[PDB]
Every structure is written in structure tokens, then in C-alpha cells.
Design an enzyme around this catalytic site. Structure first.
Site, mmCIF file in Angstrom:
data_model
loop_
_atom_site.group_PDB
_atom_site.id
_atom_site.type_symbol
_atom_site.label_atom_id
_atom_site.label_comp_id
_atom_site.label_asym_id
_atom_site.label_seq_id
_atom_site.Cartn_x
_atom_site.Cartn_y
_atom_site.Cartn_z
ATOM 1 N N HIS A 1 41.727 -75.976 100.620
ATOM 2 C CA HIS A 1 42.421 -76.177 99.345
ATOM 3 C C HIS A 1 43.907 -75.810 99.523
ATOM 4 O O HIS A 1 44.510 -75.255 100.432
ATOM 5 C CB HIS A 1 41.909 -74.719 98.348
ATOM 6 C CG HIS A 1 42.198 -73.437 98.890
ATOM 7 N ND1 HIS A 1 43.427 -72.633 98.423
ATOM 8 C CD2 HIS A 1 41.686 -72.519 99.776
ATOM 9 C CE1 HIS A 1 43.643 -71.620 98.894
ATOM 10 N NE2 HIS A 1 42.381 -71.406 99.603
ATOM 11 N N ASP B 1 47.617 -68.544 103.446
ATOM 12 C CA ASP B 1 46.454 -68.867 102.259
ATOM 13 C C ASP B 1 46.844 -69.964 101.180
ATOM 14 O O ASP B 1 47.448 -69.590 100.265
ATOM 15 C CB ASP B 1 45.746 -67.578 101.750
ATOM 16 C CG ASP B 1 44.753 -67.879 100.877
ATOM 17 O OD1 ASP B 1 43.986 -69.002 100.928
ATOM 18 O OD2 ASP B 1 44.674 -66.973 99.795
ATOM 19 N N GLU C 1 41.263 -73.666 93.730
ATOM 20 C CA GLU C 1 40.367 -72.921 94.324
ATOM 21 C C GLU C 1 40.178 -71.418 94.116
ATOM 22 O O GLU C 1 39.561 -70.561 93.944
ATOM 23 C CB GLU C 1 40.475 -73.084 95.968
ATOM 24 C CG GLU C 1 39.386 -72.240 96.851
ATOM 25 C CD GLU C 1 39.820 -70.858 96.973
ATOM 26 O OE1 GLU C 1 40.902 -70.372 96.953
ATOM 27 O OE2 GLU C 1 38.985 -70.119 97.366
ATOM 28 N N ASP D 1 39.998 -72.686 105.666
ATOM 29 C CA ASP D 1 40.659 -71.763 104.578
ATOM 30 C C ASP D 1 41.166 -70.426 105.408
ATOM 31 O O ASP D 1 40.292 -69.723 105.484
ATOM 32 C CB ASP D 1 39.783 -71.555 103.460
ATOM 33 C CG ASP D 1 40.131 -70.736 102.316
ATOM 34 O OD1 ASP D 1 41.505 -70.204 102.592
ATOM 35 O OD2 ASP D 1 39.505 -70.436 101.232
ATOM 36 N N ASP E 1 43.335 -77.466 116.910
ATOM 37 C CA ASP E 1 42.610 -78.219 118.153
ATOM 38 C C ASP E 1 41.140 -78.483 117.866
ATOM 39 O O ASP E 1 40.499 -79.217 118.012
ATOM 40 C CB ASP E 1 43.029 -77.620 119.282
ATOM 41 C CG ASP E 1 44.384 -77.850 119.841
ATOM 42 O OD1 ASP E 1 45.182 -78.824 119.015
ATOM 43 O OD2 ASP E 1 44.966 -77.033 120.522
HETATM 44 C C1 LIG Z 1 37.758 -65.319 101.298
HETATM 45 C C2 LIG Z 1 38.812 -66.191 102.034
HETATM 46 C C3 LIG Z 1 38.029 -67.326 103.068
HETATM 47 C C4 LIG Z 1 39.834 -66.615 101.272
HETATM 48 C C5 LIG Z 1 39.287 -67.139 99.927
HETATM 49 N N1 LIG Z 1 38.583 -68.337 99.760
HETATM 50 C C6 LIG Z 1 40.699 -67.578 99.272
HETATM 51 O O1 LIG Z 1 41.508 -68.583 98.888
HETATM 52 O O2 LIG Z 1 41.481 -66.500 98.930
HETATM 53 CA CA LIG Z 2 47.415 -78.193 120.383
HETATM 54 ZN ZN LIG Z 3 42.211 -69.721 100.695
HETATM 55 ZN ZN LIG Z 4 43.460 -66.946 98.395
#
Ligand SMILES: CC(C)C[C@H](N)C(=O)O
Ligand SMILES: [Ca+2]
Ligand SMILES: [Zn+2]
Ligand SMILES: [Zn+2]
Length: 277
Positions: free
Chosen positions: A85, A97, A131, A160, A266
């Protein structure tokens, strides 16, 4: 598979950081910082030869977008997808994030073009919007794929949060073949891995998993506390969160551990090459 250059991945993070700074401080759904992030990624892919598609949707009264990139060629009936995302929360730039996963997937896509790779399976990459509002973009994509096209998906790999500052190395425990492919790569570096528990069904692989597509992915930890046993196997600080700046204004360029980002980038390229043969 090629070694992904850490410097190239960090260069994408620097560009996302600047885009957030020039747009109010964030790259959140419905704010200018998100569309500007999509534009940067799309431009790099179009220059490398990909066929790109912008999918528009509306959520919370504002327009969001998913960016889908297809590498021409390969078996149209067996598609391997990888995604991440691209939106952040509104409190900050969302560098770990999820600029970390977004940049690793972008550099892997550029590596395919630089290598002149011609995979047996067709490769498709995606950057999801919204997301943070509840997997809105990846749900939109899956809800709009006809069943004939859903059955052509051989797997979906999700990235993610893969550069946490006090990292752990977690592998999703969903499809067994995808999981083994990632575990074997880390075994070769002599880095142990653990099963992913913190996130659960809370990222973009969920909509795919729910309709029967094999899924997998990598994660380096968020708000949970790293244990003594985990600090012994991976270094870092026991008793502190894997990411002390999760959803905060301090999730900036300094909120990245380079070793973890390099190893996971990688590993992503290794899985994409391996599973597309
Ligand atoms: C729970 C973690 C994988 C992160 C969550 N999906 C976020 O975007 O905050
Ligand atoms: Ca590398
Ligand atoms: Zn995330
Ligand atoms: Zn998040």
C-alpha cells in the site's frame, strides 16, 4: 535473481519524504501527497516499459487510486502479483509504513526491466490506495476482477512495513510454497525467521486470501514489544517496540533500519524470480 541495490531503494524513500514535505506533511488518502506519490511511481514504471493502469475509486467522499503495472509477456493464465500500500496515515510521511514496502516493490519491478527478464508466469505489480481506511483499494481491486481473471492468479505477495528500526524478520504463514520460498532465502543468510502474528488479516493480502488466491509476505514488526529472546536472535533493543514511530509524525527517513530494508528487498526479488519460473 539480482541483488537489489539498497541505495536505489533509499532513493525512492527520499523522493516520498520530499513529496510528503511539499504536500502538508503526509501522503494520506484524499490529500495531494497521495496522488503525487502515485505519479512518481507511475513515471518510473512507464519509463521502464511497463503497461500501467490507474484504477479510481471513491471512499469517505474523496477519490483514491490503485496503480497496477503489467510486465508484457509470460503466460496470461498464470499471473504472479506483488503489491504494497502506497498511502500513509495523516499524521506523517509513512516512510516505514509503508514507503518501505512500496519502494522495495518498485525497485524489484525496475530490476526486472534492467535484467531483461522474461518470466514463464506473467508479472503484475500493484500499489494500493486507502489501505489505512480499511483495505479499501485492494478490496476494490478484488471485488472488480471477473471470476475468470481471479482464477488466473497464481499468488499474491504483500510487503507492508519491512524496514522497522528495531526489527524482527517475520514471514506470513499462509500458502506453504510461498512461505517456504521466503524462509529458504533467509536460511541462506543465516538469519532466523518467525511466523507473522502481529498483523493478522490486517493488510492487503486479506482480500485475496479470502477468495482463494495463495498469499504470502514479509513484515518487520510494528507496535509490539521485541522480547529478550528476539533481541538475542536479531539484535536491537529488548523491551522497545519494533517501530517506535508507528503511525506517528516521526515515521520519517530516520525511521528505517537499512539492514532489514536491504534484506527484505533482496528477499522480495528472490521470491518474485523463483515463483515466476
Ligand atoms: C498491521 C501491520 C501489517 C500494518 C497495517 N496493515 C498498517 O498499514 O498499519
Ligand atoms: Ca541488496
Ligand atoms: Zn501498512
Ligand atoms: Zn498503517
Amino acid at each position: 535473481a539480482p541483488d537489489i541495490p539498497l541505495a536505489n531503494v533509499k532513493a525512492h524513500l527520499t523522493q516520498l519524504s520530499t513529496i510528503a514535505a511539499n504536500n502538508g506533511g503526509n501522503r494520506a488518502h484524499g490529500r495531494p501527497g497521495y496522488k503525487a506519490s502515485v505519479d512518481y511511481v507511475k513515471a518510473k514504471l512507464d519509463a521502464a516499459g511497463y503497461t500501467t493502469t490507474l484504477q479510481q475509486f471513491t471512499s469517505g467522499g474523496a477519490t483514491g487510486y490503485n496503480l497496477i503495472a503489467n510486465w508484457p509477456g509470460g503466460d496470461p493464465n498464470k499471473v504472479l502479483m506483488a503489491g504494497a500500500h502506497l498511502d500513509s496515515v495523516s499524521s506523517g510521511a509513512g516512510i516505514n509504513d509503508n514507503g518501505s514496502g512500496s519502494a522495495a516493490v518498485l525497485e524489484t519491478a525496475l530490476a526486472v526491466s534492467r535484467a531483461g527478464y522474461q518470466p514463464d508466469k506473467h508479472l503484475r505489480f500493484a500499489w494500493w490506495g486507502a489501505e489505512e481506511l480499511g483495505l479499501i483499494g485492494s478490496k476494490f481491486y478484488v471485488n472488480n476482477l471477473p471470476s475468470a481473471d481471479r482464477s488466473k492468479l497464481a499468488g499474491y505477495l504483500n510487503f507492508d512495513m519491512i524496514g522497522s528500526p528495531n526489527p524482527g524478520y517475520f514471514v506470513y504463514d499462509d500458502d506453504p510454497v510461498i512461505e517456504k520460498t521466503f524462509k529458504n532465502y533467509f536460511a541462506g543468510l543465516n538469519v532466523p525467521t518467525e511466523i507473522e502474528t502481529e498483523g493478522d488479516g490486517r493488510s492487503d493480502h486479506a482480500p485475496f486470501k479470502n477468495v482463494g488466491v495463495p498469499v504470502g509476505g514479509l513484515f518487520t514488526g510494528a507496535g509490539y514489544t521485541k522480547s529478550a529472546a528476539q533481541a538475542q536472535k536479531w539484535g536491537g533493543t529488548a523491551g522497545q517496540a519494533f517501530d517506535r514511530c508507528y503511525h506517528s509524525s516521526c515515521d520519517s527517513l530516520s525511521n528505517i533500519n537499512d539492514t532489514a530494508l536491504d534484506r527484505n528487498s533482496d528477499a522480495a526479488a528472490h521470491a518474485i524470480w523463483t515463483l515466476s519460473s
